[PDB]
């Protein structure tokens, strides 16, 4: 028991049999009692945890900060904002030191309606026990501490906990450096005791079971025993304010406050992690889902840190590994969370890794790791501090239990608006070219019930002609643009007829790098075509515009992850309507329109600007392919002559 399951998974306060009216709306007029100051109170506290804010209210500044500090953001349109209360969002507020009374008082003061008792109960359930006690780790001493002795006195009454406490004291300092003697200052609001080294693992279960989760903090600075590797940031590293605050939230007290950090795709996420590692100055273990992240981190460490190739070592069965003299082990979860040894190389590394005590664990894809793999990894490494990096707070593997509590509260959240208002992340023009289906392709679309249909919506001349125009348009603007598609033949036929670079699995690294270098640095290649492999880590380059030849696709979040991963702000164009663009091409009256609609919705839900396109200047005023019935027929016959395999979804690897 370490995930604090009850408020996370049990969600006691979720309503059942809701009084949904004939209009389908939740009738909370009776559940949410009317209260005065409709013009001065900017909040609505719905009993289901949703909260609404008025961006035009005079106290919006404070109310926004208040909701941002207490509730998860849902939507932030121009005049109204939506927020949702969650155990993790509430626990994050508690760990900051906010009191249930203050939270309840300011909510009741700012709410237009009286706070529903169910939400007040959820507030209590998520604030009374959720984080009142801290587990300090300084000098390798596991000190349990709380601001109030009341909390620890109750906790200390537990006989199992009493068996964990150690009778030790711890000294001061000498005149050489008597600040550690002057560290006896501010022992007010401070009470703590040491716990036996091995009892922690069991005590954690006992304290969380006892409803007193421990806020673990590693005092990397005064920890003398774990040797420092003199890790330091290169002068090239400059922290952005959101990064600085995210690190401030983490290191504000001075110790590495373990927890989860959420940074949207495109942020200097790696710079934050490298800075944290460079700040801890202790050996760090880094976890990713692929050898690509491992070498991507290694390259980013090289550019922002002093750490050498004698010190950064890769550890993943895809490549040779080097435990000897390692200082930063960068590794793949599926290697470490194995059920049974992968190789003698697992006997080499996993026994070695089970033996090492990493001072900090950095998770790059914790939002993607399943409970079993994470539980195995955490049990094996037993690192002094853990930091969870996430693209989005909601994890595809969250399901019933929010594993985030294993790491700790959320440390920081960079607001999309703050990144856009400061240009850290460009405003992305999301658009969908809803192309009318061609009569001939419509024959084949309804007749071909099998998945060979994929080419029909993909190879429509309207989609190709619009794609060709917009590419040539973005080339005229000299915008870096990448074109992605779900199929081999489709992406091939496009890139071939468009006479543009295309990358596939068989594309040798030199042939691939020739394109990449001539795209990343040579201004000549403005547009490149990338196979479905772009859906994952394939070392995709940087671009300002992305077009989905098929709006058919997988997870909306994985699509949104890919979109941010590639899109970058076009330098000097931030004054334009947009300085980043995303396109997804859609065939009207086809199976693509649902994923299009769900993308459209998910985008506006995530707050992204969206539009639909059907025709624009040049789509007919310019020379574009298939302008004749015969070439359209040849394309359609080549599509029909292509086998199901050539028409099926392209493999992602």
């Amino acid at each position: 028991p370490q995930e604090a399951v009850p408020s996370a998974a049990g969600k006691q306060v979720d309503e059942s049999g809701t009084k949904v009216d004939e209009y389908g709306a939740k009738d909370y007029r009776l559940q949410m009692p009317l209260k005065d100051d409709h013009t001065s109170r900017p909040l609505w506290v719905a009993p289901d945890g949703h909260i609404f804010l008025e961006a035009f209210s005079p106290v919006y500044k404070y109310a926004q900060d208040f909701l941002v500090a207490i509730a998860e953001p849902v939507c932030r349109p121009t005049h109204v904002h939506e927020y949702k209360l969650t155990a993790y969002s509430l626990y994050a507020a508690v760990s900051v030191g906010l009191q249930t009374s203050d939270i309840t008082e300011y909510l009741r003061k700012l709410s237009k309606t009286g706070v529903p008792d169910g939400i007040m109960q959820f507030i209590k359930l998520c604030t009374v026990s959720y984080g009142k006690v801290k587990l300090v780790l300084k000098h390798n001493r596991y000190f349990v501490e709380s601001c109030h002795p009341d909390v620890i006195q109750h906790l200390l009454q537990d006989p199992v906990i009493r068996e964990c406490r150690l009778r030790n004291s711890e000294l001061f300092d000498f005149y050489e450096q008597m600040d550690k003697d002057e560290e006896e200052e501010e022992e007010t609001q401070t009470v703590s005791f040491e716990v036996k080294q091995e009892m922690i693992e069991e005590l954690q279960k006992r304290c969380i079971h006892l409803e007193y989760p421990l806020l673990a903090e590693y005092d990397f600075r005064n920890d003398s025993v774990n040797p420092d590797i003199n890790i330091d940031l290169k002068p090239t590293a400059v922290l952005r304010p959101y990064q600085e605050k995210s690190l401030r939230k983490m290191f504000g007290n001075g110790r590495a406050r373990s927890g989860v950090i959420v940074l949207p795709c495109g942020a200097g996420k790696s710079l934050v992690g490298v800075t944290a590692a460079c700040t801890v100055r202790k050996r760090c273990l880094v976890l990713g889902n692929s050898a690509v992240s491992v070498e991507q981190w290694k390259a980013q460490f090289k550019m922002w840190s002093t750490i050498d190739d004698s010190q950064i070592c890769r550890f993943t069965s895809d490549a040779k590994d080097k435990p000897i003299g390692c200082s930063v082990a960068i590794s793949t979860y599926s290697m470490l969370g194995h059920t049974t040894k992968r190789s003698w190389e697992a006997e080499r590394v996993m026994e070695w890794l089970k033996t090492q005590e990493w001072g900090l664990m950095i998770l790059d894809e914790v939002h993607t790791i399943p409970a079993k793999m994470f539980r195995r990894v955490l049990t094996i490494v037993q690192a002094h501090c853990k930091l969870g990096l996430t693209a989005t707070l909601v994890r595809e593997d969250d399901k019933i239990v929010d594993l985030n509590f294993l790491i700790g509260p959320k440390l920081y959240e960079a607001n999309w608006m703050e990144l856009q208002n400061n240009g850290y992340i460009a405003k992305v023009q999301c658009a969908e070219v809803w192309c009318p289906m061609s009569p001939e392709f419509y024959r084949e679309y309804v007749a071909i019930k099998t998945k060979k249909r994929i080419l029909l919506y993909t190879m429509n001349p309207n989609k190709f002609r619009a794609c060709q125009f917009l590419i040539k348009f973005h080339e005229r603007r000299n915008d870096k643009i990448i074109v992605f598609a779900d199929n081999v033949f489709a992406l091939k036929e496009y890139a071939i007829r468009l006479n543009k670079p295309y990358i596939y699995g068989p594309t040798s690294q030199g042939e691939r790098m020739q394109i990449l270098q001539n795209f990343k640095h040579n201004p000549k290649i403005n547009t490149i075509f990338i196979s479905k492999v772009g859906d994952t880590s394939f070392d995709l380059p940087e671009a300002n515009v992305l077009i989905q030849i098929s709006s058919h696709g997988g997870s909306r979040r994985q699509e949104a992850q890919r979109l941010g991963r590639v899109l970058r702000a076009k330098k000097g164009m931030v004054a334009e309507e947009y300085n980043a663009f995303f396109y997804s091409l859609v065939s009207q009256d086809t199976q693509e329109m649902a994923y299009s609609t769900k993308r459209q919705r998910f985008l506006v839900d995530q707050g992204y600007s969206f539009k639909v396109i059907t025709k624009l200047a040049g789509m007919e005023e310019e020379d574009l392919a298939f302008s004749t019935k015969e070439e359209q027929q040849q394309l359609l016959q080549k599509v029909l002559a292509a086998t199901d395999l050539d028409a099926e979804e392209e493999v992602v690897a």
């Binding site: 005065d36 100051d37 001065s40 005079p58 106290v59 404070y62 900060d65 030191g97 700012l110």
Partner: protein
């Protein structure tokens, strides 16, 4: 750990809904300043100096300093001509330790504002060279007639400037040349500019907000005062009458103004050289005689005999009519204004609009 609790209800009971009433003065303004019956530099040659250095890219204001500056510059350019069509403008940009004369000496907002629009695309580069800027300016002002108030307005964004020689060379020259220089600084007070402005006869001010930035610019819209050291001239001026192509364009060919390419068939001719000018007022590029429209002269005469502030009181204690004189209407506001001379009843809009826009009090005309 204070921003989510920064509301007024953080430590008060009534502030739970009176917060916007307790902090109610959050965004308002109330512009007024003094005046004086002193000689004014009605003939005005004001030149604008704007930092072109990388420091102009900072976001001290809502947009980068460049955007906010150009935004307010356009507005200032408009009103400058609007309040003094006789005067002329020119612009110089201080970039790459160099200075570039964005706009020459002219009175055409069309060209000046057009230049601003294009100047939005400028590249903030290098450090500023105050010496180079003043060189180009003074080099130009040298040729201007002494009676024309030769003035420069400087907008400084950076704090360090690359001068090839001590600016005391220029200041000593400017002082001897009686040229006046004023400076507007961004977020800081620089001794260089303060000494430069105070010694040269201008003033150094610092921008606080876009409103303050306008407030400062507003002061620079009014002509500067003049001393007996400047030439008290009796400048020759032309008042050409507009002349259409009335006689079926007979013996009156259409012509382009000295600035303009527009070939105008009718317009103002130069009484001195007979040149064709579609607009007025226009300086004779080929004679030196300036041509000005008789109403433009009267357009500036308010500066010679402006209004005085009216007696303000929270109530019409003098018991005049319940209807405000001037603009008829009820004294709905518990603040009244009364002219010292005519002593009629005036409202908030009367005190603002009559004194700042009409410049004439109705009861004083009686």
């Amino acid at each position: 750990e204070r921003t989510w609790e920064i509301l007024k209800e953080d430590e008060s009971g009534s502030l739970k809904a009176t917060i916007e009433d307790i902090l109610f003065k959050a965004k308002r303004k109330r512009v007024f300043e003094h005046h004086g019956q002193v000689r004014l530099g009605m003939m005005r040659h004001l030149y604008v100096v704007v930092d072109g250095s990388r420091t102009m890219e900072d976001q001290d204001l809502k947009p980068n300093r460049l955007t906010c500056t150009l935004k307010l510059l356009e507005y200032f350019v408009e009103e400058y001509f609007d309040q003094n069509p006789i005067s002329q403008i020119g612009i110089i940009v201080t970039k790459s330790k160099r200075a570039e004369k964005l706009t020459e000496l002219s009175g055409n907002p069309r060209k000046h504002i057009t230049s601003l629009k294009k100047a939005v695309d400028m590249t903030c580069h290098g450090e500023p060279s105050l010496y180079n800027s003043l060189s180009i300016a003074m080099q130009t002002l040298k040729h201007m007639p002494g009676h024309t108030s030769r003035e420069v307005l400087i907008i400084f964004s950076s704090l360090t400037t690359c001068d090839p020689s001590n600016i005391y060379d220029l200041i000593k020259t400017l002082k001897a040349a009686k040229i006046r220089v004023s400076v507007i600084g961004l977020s800081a007070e620089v001794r260089v500019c303060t000494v430069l402005a105070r010694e040269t006869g201008g003033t150094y001010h610092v921008i606080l907000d876009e409103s303050h930035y306008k407030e400062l610019l507003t002061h620079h819209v009014s002509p500067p005062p003049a001393s007996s050291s400047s030439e008290c001239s009796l400048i020759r001026m032309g008042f050409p009458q507009h002349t259409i192509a009335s006689l079926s364009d007979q013996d009156a060919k259409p012509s382009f103004s000295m600035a303009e390419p527009g070939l105008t068939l009718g317009g103002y001719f130069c009484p001195q050289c007979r040149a064709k000018y579609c607009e007025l007022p226009v300086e004779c590029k080929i004679c030196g005689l300036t041509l000005v429209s008789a109403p433009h002269l009267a357009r500036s005469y308010h500066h010679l005999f402006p209004l005085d502030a009216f007696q303000e009181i929270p109530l019409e204690e003098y018991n005049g009519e319940r209807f405000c004189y001037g603009c008829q209407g009820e004294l709905k506001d518990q603040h009244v204004y009364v002219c010292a001379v005519c002593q009629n009843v005036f409202c908030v809009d009367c005190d603002v609009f009559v004194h700042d826009s009409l410049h004439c009090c109705p009861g004083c005309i009686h």
